[PDB]
Amino acid sequence: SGFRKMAFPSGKVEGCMVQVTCGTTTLNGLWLDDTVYCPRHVICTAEDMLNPNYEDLLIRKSNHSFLVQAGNVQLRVIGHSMQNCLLRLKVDTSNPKTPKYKFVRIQPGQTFSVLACYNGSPSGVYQCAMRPNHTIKGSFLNGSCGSVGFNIDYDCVSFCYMHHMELPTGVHAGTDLEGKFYGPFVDRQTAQAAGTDTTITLNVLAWLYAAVINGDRWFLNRFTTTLNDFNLVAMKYNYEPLTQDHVDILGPLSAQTGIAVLDMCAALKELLQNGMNGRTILGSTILEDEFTPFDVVRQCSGVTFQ
Amino acid sequence: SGFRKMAFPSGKVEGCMVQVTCGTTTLNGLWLDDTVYCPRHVICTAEDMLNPNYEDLLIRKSNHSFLVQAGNVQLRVIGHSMQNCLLRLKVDTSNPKTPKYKFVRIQPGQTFSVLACYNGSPSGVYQCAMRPNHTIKGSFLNGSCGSVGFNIDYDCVSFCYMHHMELPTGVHAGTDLEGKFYGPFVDRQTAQAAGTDTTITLNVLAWLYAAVINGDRWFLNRFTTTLNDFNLVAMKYNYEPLTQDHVDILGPLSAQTGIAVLDMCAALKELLQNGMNGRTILGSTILEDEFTPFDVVRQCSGVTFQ
Numbered sequence: 001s002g003f004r005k006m007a008f009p010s011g012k013v014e015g016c017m018v019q020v021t022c023g024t025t026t027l028n029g030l031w032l033d034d035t036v037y038c039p040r041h042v043i044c045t046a047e048d049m050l051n052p053n054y055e056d057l058l059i060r061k062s063n064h065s066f067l068v069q070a071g072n073v074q075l076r077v078i079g080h081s082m083q084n085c086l087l088r089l090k091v092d093t094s095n096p097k098t099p100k101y102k103f104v105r106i107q108p109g110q111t112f113s114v115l116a117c118y119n120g121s122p123s124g125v126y127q128c129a130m131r132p133n134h135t136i137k138g139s140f141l142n143g144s145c146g147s148v149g150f151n152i153d154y155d156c157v158s159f160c161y162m163h164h165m166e167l168p169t170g171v172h173a174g175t176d177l178e179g180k181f182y183g184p185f186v187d188r189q190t191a192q193a194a195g196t197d198t199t200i201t202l203n204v205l206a207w208l209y210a211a212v213i214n215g216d217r218w219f220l221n222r223f224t225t226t227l228n229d230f231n232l233v234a235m236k237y238n239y240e241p242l243t244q245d246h247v248d249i250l251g252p253l254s255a256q257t258g259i260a261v262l263d264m265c266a267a268l269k270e271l272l273q274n275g276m277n278g279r280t281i282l283g284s285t286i287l288e289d290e291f292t293p294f295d296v297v298r299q300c301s302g303v304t305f306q
Numbered sequence: 307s308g309f310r311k312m313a314f315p316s317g318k319v320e321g322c323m324v325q326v327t328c329g330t331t332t333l334n335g336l337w338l339d340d341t342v343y344c345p346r347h348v349i350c351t352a353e354d355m356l357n358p359n360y361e362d363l364l365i366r367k368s369n370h371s372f373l374v375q376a377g378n379v380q381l382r383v384i385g386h387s388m389q390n391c392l393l394r395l396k397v398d399t400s401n402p403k404t405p406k407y408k409f410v411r412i413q414p415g416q417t418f419s420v421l422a423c424y425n426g427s428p429s430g431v432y433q434c435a436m437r438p439n440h441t442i443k444g445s446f447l448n449g450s451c452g453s454v455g456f457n458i459d460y461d462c463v464s465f466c467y468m469h470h471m472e473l474p475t476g477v478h479a480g481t482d483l484e485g486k487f488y489g490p491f492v493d494r495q496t497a498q499a500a501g502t503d504t505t506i507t508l509n510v511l512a513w514l515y516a517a518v519i520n521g522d523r524w525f526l527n528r529f530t531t532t533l534n535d536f537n538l539v540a541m542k543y544n545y546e547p548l549t550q551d552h553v554d555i556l557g558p559l560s561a562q563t564g565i566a567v568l569d570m571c572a573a574l575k576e577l578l579q580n581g582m583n584g585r586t587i588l589g590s591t592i593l594e595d596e597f598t599p600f601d602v603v604r605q606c607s608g609v610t611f612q
C-alpha cells in the first residue's frame with residue numbers, strides 16, 4: 001500500500017555523468033560509448049548568451065578547447081560537432097559503464113526521473129512531469145545544465161531530457177538528446193516566458209484509479225457523463241479536454257477497478273464543482289496530475305483492495 | 307529555483323541488493339563485504355508469523371537452508387546468525403561493489419531515501435520522513451521486505467532502515483541495520499497499530515525558510531512569539547512542541563534569511579490560525595513537514611532571492 005512520487009533507480013545514469021569545461025564555463029555531460037553530450041551553451045561566456053551565433057562561436061574552437069573529466073580521469077576529445085542545441089564530443093575512451101540505452105522524445109503529460117548533477121557529480125533524483133506548456137517544475141541551481149531526465153524499462157535507459165535553462169518563473173526548459181528544445185524556447189537571452197499551462201486530465205483520472213486500487217471509493221458517485229459534458233466542466237477549471245484516445249488509455253485501470261471511465265469522469269466533475277470537503281485522496285488535499293496511467297500500473301498492486 | 311522531494315542517487319545501494327530464499331519464502335537482502343543482511347522473517351512460513359519462536363525456527367536451519375542470488379550469481383552461505391530482528395548470512399564472496407558505509411539509527415523527524423526492491427531487483431527510489439510515531443508513509447507491495455533506507459554524505463552510505471512490515475493503516479515499519487525496530491513494533495501477528503502521530507514542527511519551519519530563500523515572503527508578519535505562547539497554539543493543531551534545541555538548529559537558515567526563528571514561529575502561528583487563504587508556499591496548499599533543516603540547506607541556493 002501507499003503511493004509516492006517514485007523515481008527510477010539512478011545507478012545506470014550515474015555511471016554516465018561527466019564534467020565538460022570550455023574556458024571558464026563548466027557544466028555536466030552524458031558519456032555513452034565514445035560520445036559526450038552536453039548543452040552547446042558550454043562554448044559561451046555569460047555575455048555571449050545575449051546574442052550568440054553558435055556556428056561562429058564553435059568554428060573558433062579545437063578538440064583541445066574542451067576538457068572532459070570522468071571522476072578523476074581526463075578524457076581526451078578527438079572530435080566535436082553541433083547537433084541542434086547539443087554539442088557531441090568524441091572521446092578516445094568508450095564508457096565501460098554505458099547501459100543499454102535509447103534516445104526518446106517524450107510527449108507532454110509524460111513523466112521521467114531527473115538526476116540533478118553539478119560538476120559531473122550526481123546530487124539527487126526526483127520525478128518530473130513534462131507540463132503541457134513544455135516546462136518542468138524541477139529543482140535546479142547554477143551548474144545543473146547537462147543534468148538528464150530518463151525512464152528505465154527492463155535495464156534499457158530511455159534518455160528523454162537534457163537541462164538547459166531556468167525561465168523567469170523558476171520553471172525549467174531543455175532538450176531531447178538530439179538537442180531539440182521541448183517547447184518554443186531558445187538558448188539565448190530573449191523575453192521568452194513559460195506559456196499558459198493546464199492540468200493533465202488523463203493523469204488526474206489515473207491517480208483517482210490508483211486511489212480505488214489502494215481501497216478508497218469516497219469520491220465516486222451514481223452519475224455518468226458524456227465526453228462533451230465533461231469537457232464543458234474541464235474548460236471552466238483549466239483542465240485539458242478529455243479525448244476518446246485518453247478514455248481508451250484508461251481501459252486497463254477501468255477493468256482492474258470495475259469503474260467505467262465516464263463514471264470516473266463524473267466523479268472528477270463532482271470533485272471540480274464541490275471540492276474535496278476537507279477530505280484527502282492518497283493523502284493529498286488536491287487533485288494530483290503528475291502520475292500517468294503507466295506510473296499507476298507500475299506502482300500499484302495488480303489486486304484491487306475491494 | 308524549485309523545491310522537490312529529492313532522494314539521494316541510488317547507484318551505491320543498487321550494487322548491494324540481492325535475493326534471499328529460505329524454502330518457499332523470498333525477500334531482499336543487503337550484501338556488504340562478505341555479509342548479507344535480511345529480515346529474520348525469511349525463515350518463517352506465512353503461518354509461522356502467527357506466533358514464531360525465531361530461536362527455535364533458526365536452530366532447525368543449516369547454511370544450505372539459505373539461497374542468496376546476486377544478479378545471476380549464486381552466493382554460497384558459509385555461516386548464519388540472528389541479530390535482533392535481522393539474519394546475518396556469511397557468504398564465500400566479498401561484494402566488489404561495497405561502498406564506504408556506516409549503520410546509523412535515525413531519529414524521529416529525520417528523512418532518508420528508500421530503494422524499493424523486489425526479488426533483489428531495485429524498482430524505485432523516493433524520500434521518506436521517519437514519523438514521530440516511528441512509521442514511514444512508504445509505497446511497498448508484497449516482496450518488498452529487506453528494501454533499505456539510506457542517506458549519502460561524501461560517497462559514504464549511511465544505512466538507516468530495513469523494511470519488515472505494513473501495518474493495518476497502510477503505513478510501514480522496520481528496523482535499523484542492527485535489527486532493532488523503530489517504534490514498539492514486533493515481527494509477529496498482534497493487534498499492533500500505528501500510534502497517534504504529530505506534525506514535525508521543526509521541518510515545517512525549515513520549509514518556510516526554504517520558501518523565503520526561494521524568494522517568497524507573503525506569509526511573514528510583524529509579530530513575534532515566545533516559545534511557550536507558540537506551544538499553546540502547537541498543542542491545539544497537533545504540532546510537536548518547539549524546543550530551544552529546535553530554535554538553535556534553525557540558526558543557519560535564520561541567518562541566511564535575516565528572519566529570527568521566533569518571528570518565523572509567529573508566521574506559522576498565523577498560518578495555523580488563519581489558514582493559507584487560497585495561497586501556496588513552494589507550490590503547496592498545505593504546510594510540508596517532510597524536509598529537515600539539513601534537507602533545505604542541501605537543496606536550496608546559499609544566496610537568498612531578496
Ligand SMILES: O=C(Cn1nnc2ccccc21)N(Cc1ccsc1)c1ccc(-c2c[nH]cn2)cc1
Nearest residue numbers: 044045046049140141142164165166187188189307
Ligand atoms: O537559465 C540558465 C542556466 N540555468 N539553468 N538552470 C538554472 C537554474 C538556476 C540558475 C541558472 C540556471 N541561463 C539563463 C539563460 C540566458 C540566455 S538563455 C538562458 C544561463 C545562464 C548563464 C549561462 C552561461 C553560459 N556561459 C556561462 N554562463 C548559460 C545559461
Ligand SMILES: O=C(Cn1nnc2ccccc21)N(Cc1ccsc1)c1ccc(-c2c[nH]cn2)cc1
Nearest residue numbers: 001350351352355446447448470471472493494495
Ligand atoms: O506486512 C507484512 C509484510 N509486508 N511488508 N510490507 C508489505 C506491503 C504489502 C504487503 C505485505 C507487506 N507482513 C505482515 C505481518 C504478520 C506478522 S508481522 C507482519 C508479512 C506477511 C507475510 C510474511 C511471510 C513470512 N513468510 C512468508 N510470508 C511476513 C510478513
